[PDB]
């Protein structure tokens, strides 16, 4: 899903966004809350195709940051691909209140056998992006755990390859 996006920069000269270079592409690494980025809808894993009509292809992360830093004007224009490689898995808690997977640093590392996670095809080495529509990127494992345990029996998670 490709969409265009226009940011109006802060009070303190910034848009609240850090990017990373992966395989000659540019991706949203971190979105600060209530930032110009947040208002517009940017998320971890979103791909930045161009900034101000200039292709991001092959850029270093540092470079993308210089380009965003040396931004002429208060408005920044970004062509965006909505997070690619994303998946969604809906699981159901069992009697013990588990869905059946282990995680560590927001990443799913193993799938418990014969669990809801197994029958619904949860993947390993994937980050946990949203839980029941609620963002958890940047949260500590304990916070994620609380969101999980305070959810109902239905647990729908959006994940993404690490």
């Amino acid at each position: 899903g490709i969409r265009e996006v226009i940011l109006c920069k802060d009070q303190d000269g910034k848009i609240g966004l850090r990017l990373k270079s992966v395989d000659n592409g540019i991706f949203v690494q971190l979105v600060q809350a209530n930032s110009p980025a947040s208002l517009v809808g940017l998320r971890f894993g979103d791909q930045v195709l161009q900034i101000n009509g200039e292709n991001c292809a092959g850029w270093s992360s540092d470079k993308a940051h210089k380009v965003l830093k040396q931004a002429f004007g208060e408005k920044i224009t970004m062509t965006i691909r909505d997070r690619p490689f994303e998946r969604t898995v809906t699981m159901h808690k069992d009697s013990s209140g588990h869905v059946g997977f282990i995680f560590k640093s927001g990443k799913i590392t193993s799938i418990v056998k014969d669990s809801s996670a197994a029958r619904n095809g949860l993947l390993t080495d994937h980050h946990i992006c949203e839980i029941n529509g609620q963002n958890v990127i940047g949260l500590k494992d304990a916070q994620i755990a609380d969101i999980l345990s305070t959810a109902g029996t239905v647990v729908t998670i959006t994940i993404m390859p690490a």
Binding site: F101, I102, F103, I144
Partner: peptide
């Protein structure tokens, strides 16, 4: 050391 792993 702790494994710091979580179970869901």
């Amino acid at each position: 050391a702790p494994t710091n792993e979580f179970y869901a």
